[PDB]
From a paper:
The first step of the incorporation pathway involves the activation of sialic acid to a cytidine monophosphate diester form catalyzed by CMP-sialic acid synthetase (EC 2.7.7.43), a ubiquitous enzyme that is found in both prokaryotes and eukaryotes. In the presence of Mg2+, CMP-sialic acid synthetase (CMAS) catalyzes a sequential ordered reaction that involves a nucleophilic attack on the α-phosphate of CTP by the anomeric O atom of β-Neu5Ac and the production of CMP-sialic acid and pyrophosphate (PPi). The activated sialic acid is then incorporated into LOS or LPS by sialyltransferases. In this report, we present crystal structures of the apo form of the VcCMAS enzyme and of that complexed with cytidine diphos­phate (CDP) and Mg2+.
Author numbering:
A (entry chain B): 3 to 15, 19 to 73, 79 to 228
B (entry chain A): 3 to 11, 20 to 73, 80 to 226
């Protein structure tokens, strides 16, 4: 089994992917995390921006030049098409890695591929259990009323007595290139969770997010 | 017509801008024109001394369940109070950012909608409507629908989380069920900022800095 790492990074309009973090641009961490994992064969950055592509090429990553608020699937399908045409080796699985998740390491990627193999999953998605579990939330009805999202008794039943609810952190998406091509979407069946902490689930959007992560890092 | 405020009680006495945490919820209830009397359901002499100091009336409870504290309070009110109260306004002492205005707007909605229950909520930054539920085989699928984690927020129905600041219900309905109404429940929506529930000392520190 051969895996390819795909890192999707666009340009500014906040140019977050190139923001410095402990002396390496944000995207650098995710390229290095991918490159440092023994299961990853090649690392590709789909970018529409010169600075992202030059940084990427500087760290030994291969640039997928992307054309012109585009769909995320249309980016993966383009990447799959580019890989089919420009690469000799057939890749089994794609490891989609968001450049704004610097706290997701090579170990996380390793453990997520190990689970994708062990469970023989169609899809592995990196998740976290929120502090306020969605399993005890309420859903707004058409009349304006509210009732339990899981069941009517759920907001009142304790956490232990209810099934685990997860939120995606967007750090890792491990899937089969062949299945994705068939559907033109992510697998809706045999989807398994790779559970990470709420701490490790940091998604840099603002400079306060970046500052918290600069501090966190020690 | 008539509403009674019930505040169920080391966190509750923690100082916040010169008043113990419970003081804020006591004052918020007392400052609302729709609230007739304010009680603090507590099993500690130090909390009951502070509560009485801030003009709240103490319901002395025996030295854990939330419903057992609501029904005890209802029983105490039946026996020790002459006036019959229609609705109970349950107010958590760990929600100091919930004001008399919030309580007012909450009761105004309980009346306007003619609800059986009104619960103070907030729309989380990560909507529960786009979350995943763990199956028995170990697999995961959308909590609302299988397509939900992939459908955009706008195209999906509003999911709320309770902040626990306000629970407006009928004393007569809760007595017969021995639980909260499961029908005609309406949401009173507050911000994620106003939804602060003091648990840790970092939570208090963040609330002081406001
Ligand atoms: Ca781990
Ligand atoms: Ca308001």
């Amino acid at each position: 089994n051969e895996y390819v790492a795909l890192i999707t990074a666009r340009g500014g309009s906040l140019r977050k992917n190139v923001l410095p973090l402990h002396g390496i641009p944000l995207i650098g961490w995710t390229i290095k995390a991918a490159q440092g994992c023994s299961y990853i064969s090649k690392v590709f950055v789909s970018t529409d921006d010169y600075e992202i592509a030059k940084i990427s090429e500087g760290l030994g990553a291969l640039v997928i030049n992307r054309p012109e608020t585009a769909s995320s699937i249309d980016v993966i399908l383009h990447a799959i098409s580019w890989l089919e045409q420009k690469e000799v080796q057939k890749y089994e699985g794609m490891i989609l890695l968001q450049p704004t998740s610097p706290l997701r390491t090579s170990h996380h990627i390793k453990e997520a591929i190990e689970l994708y193999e062990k469970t023989a999953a169609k899809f592995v998605i990196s998740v976290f259990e929120p502090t306020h579990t969605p399993i005890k939330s309420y859903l707004e009805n058409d009349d304006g009323t509210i009732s339990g999202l899981y069941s009517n008794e759920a907001p009142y039943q304790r956490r232990q007595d209810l099934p685990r609810a997860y939120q995606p952190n967007g750090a890792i998406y491990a899937f089969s290139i062949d299945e994705f091509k068939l559907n033109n979407h992510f697998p809706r069946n045999k989807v398994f969770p790779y559970v990470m902490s709420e701490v490790e689930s940091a998604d840099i959007d603002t400079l306060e997010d970046l500052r918290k992560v600069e501090e966190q890092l020690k």
